[PDB]
Amino acid sequence: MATPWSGYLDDVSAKFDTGVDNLQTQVTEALDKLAAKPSDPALLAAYQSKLSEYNLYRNAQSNTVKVFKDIDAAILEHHHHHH
Structure with missing residues (x-):
């Protein structure tokens, strides 16, 4: 359960602004x-x-975005594992 990301964008997206800075x-x-x-x-x-x-850090910041999806697919398998 969460509050919508559009109310917290400058913290949720802003996570990028310090990882980019390692690049x-x-x-x-x-x-x-x-x-x-x-x-x-x-x-x-x-x-x-x-x-x-x-720009590859930027590319990875368009992969991670589709890997949190993979944790959520593990959550999807966890709902089946309730059987």
Whole structure:
């Protein structure tokens, strides 16, 4: 039982804003290098990698969203397990 997510959105969705930041901190530290010796391709390509990994954090934040569904499918099996 819960209250509707639209009344609590800036806590429920806002969970993303600190998990994204574990990716952002990472891209920004690749950028801490790219601000140091910029187009050095060994660091700049790690930046441009992390820049994509952060969009993969975003992709994972469209998988988790469909995995809470899988816990709920385990809840679905728990209703059958009442037999």
